[PDB]
Design a protein around this nucleic acid. Sequence first.
DNA 1: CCGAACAAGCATCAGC
DNA 2: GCTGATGCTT
DNA 3: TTCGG
Length: 326
Amino acid sequence: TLNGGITDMLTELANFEKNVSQAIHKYNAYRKAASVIAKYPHKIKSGAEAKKLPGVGTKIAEKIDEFLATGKLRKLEKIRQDDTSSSINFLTRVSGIGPSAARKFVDEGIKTLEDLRKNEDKLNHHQRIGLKYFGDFEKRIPREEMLQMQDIVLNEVKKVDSEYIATVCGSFRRGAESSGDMDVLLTHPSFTSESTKQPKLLHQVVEQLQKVHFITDTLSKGETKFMGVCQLPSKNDEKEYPHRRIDIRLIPKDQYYCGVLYFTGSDIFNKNMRAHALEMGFTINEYTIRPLGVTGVAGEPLPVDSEKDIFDYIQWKYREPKDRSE
DNA sequence: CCGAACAAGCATCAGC
DNA sequence: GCTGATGCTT
DNA sequence: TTCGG
Ligand SMILES: Nc1nc2c(ncn2[C@H]2C[C@H](O)[C@@H](COP(=O)(O)OP(=O)(O)OP(=O)(O)O)O2)c(=O)[nH]1
Ligand SMILES: [Cl-]
Ligand SMILES: [Mg+2]
Ligand code: NA
Ligand code: NA
Ligand code: NA
């Protein structure tokens, strides 16, 4: 991490704008600048050198100059001293609490973890589980544990129905040595863009993973998206493992390639690629890539038989998952 | 200067 | 109940 | 906050 100091500052600014100012485009600007700088293979010596990078503008170059000169950013130092900003930033670290709820809680005087714990009755279900596992969800997952989790998920899925295909995506598929959570893409031949021939396809999998005590809690659940909590089993007299966030996404079987591109990410990579798609005259979601008409309206889905097919449409060279961590 | 900035599932709420 | 907007999340 | 046009 050549420029870790700069990218930390930009990320802290990103988080301030999202959580406190509720300024989504400022948030995206700082996040993109941090991503482009994190990829940059030289130690940055000035804001002017940084300003040559796409996504670093005048204002960010000035902050980089102040940071390189002093090691600090005065703007951030004040933000950390502001109690309301500090408390709002803190509360958004609970899963289910965003900037609106965080500011509403602070208004009601709920400003600390203890404050939250004694006010469980003011939390919705998602927020309540996020508070329950607050510390655990802060811990990263070593890839060695990701492998054990993969093995459990893929084998339990096979026991429900041998025609399910479960793929672990996210940072795991990009080869990361540690992950924030586990992301499972799920397909079954009975669920295509053309019909749903069996009900409960996601439910059956969730229920099986609950039965074997792998899934421990649910944050949200519908017919195609599950967001929840899981935990590896531990040996006799060993510590328990931390509880972990798990997302499962059932995708139409014929739309796997758009689905695995979406769920492999990164999130910034997806934003970058979807923005370039638009400039090339296409729109990409997790299901399809479609041409944009002369008006702007999305046309019919184009045929896709590999992830690389999607890169070709927008005239991008293919990038392996490992080169998509932006 | 100024408009666009990725795309969408689930939970929750207001209004009907 | 349903529809649409908003929050929060991937 | 940044960029393209
Ligand atoms: N198009 C789009 N996709 C997103 C967005 N956020 C997340 N995703 C997709 C790409 C992610 O790689 C993938 C999983 O979301 P995660 O939050 O788990 O990110 P990821 O696994 O990459 O990193 P992690 O190690 O879990 O912190 O979902 C988004 O804002 N837009
Ligand atoms: Cl903004
Ligand atoms: Mg993940
Ligand atoms: Na630039
Ligand atoms: Na949060
Ligand atoms: Na995830």
